[PDB]
């Protein structure tokens, strides 16, 4: 079990986010038009999966959104952009707000997935939310780049996310 | 069993009746901190209970139910969706209201279940139904409505009429 921090305060992280050279969980998680999307659908293709704590927000930073349409448009490539916000809340999201190849999924259903990618934040003020991550996935499931951000309201290294793509 | 244009929706177990007593809930603020329902004490709960609220339009008689209830004495609104408070915001039914506060379902879907608003099939599985329970000083359950249609109002009067 992992443990990381929310502005300075720690943050216990239930589960082991999959290590370089694990294969990954498949999961089915919600999309904006409430219908169901699987990990499975994606066979073939390469998975950025940017998880995060809270896309509902009015602000955005360029490197997010910069990093998220980059990874789109390199070839046979897909962006996930995952959060525990409702399907109502990430469509207000600007680092996936019009860009292509990038789609959100709600932990609404398949909640488990969270467990299963070790990013479950099960203590304090953001408890049944996630915790930041990045995880990427070549075409048939492998980890080739995972990084558990220590702080939250930091960001993850999008310059290695992109050179393992390669 | 509820429905959703269209077709029949379950939810898990079923909506406290008038004479039952509430059973204690804790549920997250806008704040991201925990707030129980003991935490109202002496007070008449209103559990005004929405599928989402998340939206920039309502039809204003959502607003004006809670209003009215917010005003009247020894009141305190409660508005339950499965949004997360960072969507509770914005909704055009709760905003600046004097005694109403809105709570998230993210760590209480055990909630859901002591209250049957949990709705497990369809698009809107996870989510909560459409309902309203009003609770007295005592948290003795007066007026229980679980709307079978969710893009349906339910009886504000009958709800209202319980409270005086």
Do not use: M, W
Request: with cysteine; charged share 20%; net charge negative.
């Amino acid at each position: 079990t992992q443990t990381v921090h929310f502005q300075g305060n720690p943050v216990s992280v239930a589960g082991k986010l999959p290590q370089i050279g694990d294969k990954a969980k498949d999961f089915t998680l919600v999309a904006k038009d409430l219908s169901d999307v699987a990990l499975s659908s994606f066979a073939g293709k390469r998975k950025v999966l940017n998880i995060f704590p809270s896309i509902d927000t009015g602000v955005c930073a360029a490197s997010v959104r910069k990093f998220n349409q980059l990874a789109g448009e390199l070839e046979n490539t897909v962006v996930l952009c995952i959060s525990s916000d409702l399907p109502f809340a990430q469509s207000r999201f600007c680092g996936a707000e019009g860009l292509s190849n990038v789609i959100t999924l709600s932990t609404l259903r398949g909640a488990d997935f969270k467990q299963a990618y070790g990013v479950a934040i099960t203590e304090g003020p953001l408890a049944g939310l996630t915790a930041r991550a990045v995880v990427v996935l070549d075409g048939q499931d492998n980890v080739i780049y995972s990084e558990l951000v220590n702080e939250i309201t930091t960001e993850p290294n999008y310059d290695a996310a992109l050179a393992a793509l390669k």
